[PDB]
Amino acid sequence: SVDEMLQKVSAAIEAGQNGQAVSYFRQTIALNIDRTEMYYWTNVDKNSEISSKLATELALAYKKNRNYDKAYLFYKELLQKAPNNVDCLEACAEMQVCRGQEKDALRMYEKILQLEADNLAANIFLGNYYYLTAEQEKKKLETDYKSPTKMQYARYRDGLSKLFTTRYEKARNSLQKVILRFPSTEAQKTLDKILRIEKEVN
Ligand SMILES: [Zn+2]
Ligand SMILES: [Zn+2]
């Protein structure tokens, strides 16, 4: 039973054997994640070092189960203990993207860049975000134009220029920091496509 397993976790914590406490805690998540979650809120001392270990296991467990609401709750519980930790911010941001909170997820990634300019995780997401969002805007711009009048053609090419400097520029800035010291085929294949779109728009 899970209730018996949880007493071993409680005993291992009081005996100073944190290693086996986390091991039995991981096994209780497999048996019953709902009851284990309740044990964390009711019995675990939130001011101890072990608290963060137990919270991380529940966050990882809900993330694998596709329950993005619960995964966020626990990554947020970790984030309260260290608000400026880029790795803690990264974990919450990914769950907000999966839940559909696009705007709030965009904020957390931008906050990571403020704390660390060359952060690998934030620059990967944003580099792809701006490139993909600028690609759909470029298709909308071409579908409207493609009589025609040269005034409308001026407005068409100006849209391509404005969208490039505003959106594509931010995509390339993030993608260059990604391949600063760690090469990537996924990063370099996008940079040549941005370079291709640049010479067409002038
Ligand atoms: Zn991550
Ligand atoms: Zn760095």
CA distances from 162 to 4, 133, 141, 142, 157 (A): 63, 14, 11, 14, 9
The CA 198 to ligand 1 mean position distance, Å, reads 31
CB 126 within 8 A of CB 145: no
Maximum CA pair distance of the chain? 83
- Closest ligand to 109 CA? 1
Sign of the CA dihedral with 79 first, then 81, 84, and 85 last:
negative
| In contact, 56 and 72? CB cutoff 8 Å | no
- Answer whether the bond into residue 83 is a cis peptide, omega within 30°: no
- Residue 21 CA to ligand 1 centre (angstroms): 25
Return the amino acid letter for 146: K
Token pair listed for 4:
């018996």
**Nearest to residue 81, comparing CAs of 113, 40, 53?**
53
Tokens of 18: 């944190």
Q: What domain range includes position 98?
A: 1-202
Residue with tokens 């407005």: 155
d(CA 171, CA 44): 43
Q: Measured between alpha carbons, how far is 40 from 49 in angstroms, rounded to an integer?
A: 13
Nearest ligand to residue 108 Cα:
1
Resolution value (Å, 1 decimal) = 2.2
Distance 122 CA to ligand 1 centre (A): 9
Q: Is the Cβ–Cβ distance between 113 and 122 less than 8 Å?
A: yes
CA nearest neighbour of 34 among 78, 9, 4, 70: 70
Residues 138, 163: contact at Cβ < 8 Å?
Answer: yes
Q: Give ∠ CA 37-33-42 in degrees, rounded to 5.
A: 20
Q: Which ligand sits nearest to residue 112's alpha carbon?
A: 2
Q: How far is the CA of 97 from the centre of ligand 1 (A)?
A: 12
The owner of tokens 């090419």 is 157
Q: What one-character-per-residue DSSP string does the chain give?
A: -HHHHHHHHHHHHHTT-HHHHHHHHHHHHHH-HHHHHHHHHHTS-TTSHHHHHHHHHHHHHHHHTT-HHHHHHHHHHHHHH-TT-HHHHHHHHHHHHHHT-HHHHHHHHHHHHHH-TT-HHHHHHHHHHHHHHHHHHHHHHHHHH----HHHHHHHHHHHHHHIIIIIHHHHHHHHHHTTTS--HHHHHHHHHHHHHHHHH-
- Using CA atoms, how far apart are residues 142 and 132, in angstroms rounded to an integer? 16
- What's the sign of the alpha-carbon dihedral 41, 42, 48, 53? negative
Q: What are the φ/ψ torsions at residue 50 (nearest 5 degrees)?
A: -60, -30
Q: How much distance in Å is there from the Cα of 177 to the middle of ligand 2?
A: 10
Please enumerate, as own/partner, the contacts of 105-114 that have beta carbons within 8 Å and a separation of 24 or more: 112/86
CB neighbours of residue 179 within 10 Å: 17
Q: Directed axis angle between helix 150-163 and helix 120-145, to 10°?
A: 170
How was it solved? X-ray
Q: What are all long-range contacts of 187-190, with beta carbons under 8 Å and residues at least 24 apart? A: 187/124, 187/127, 190/127, 190/128, 190/131
Distance 90 CA to ligand 1 centre (A): 5
Ligand nearest to the CA of 181: 2
Smallest-distance ligand from the CA of 121:
1
Number of compact structural domains in the chain: 1
| CATH for 16 | 1.25.40.10
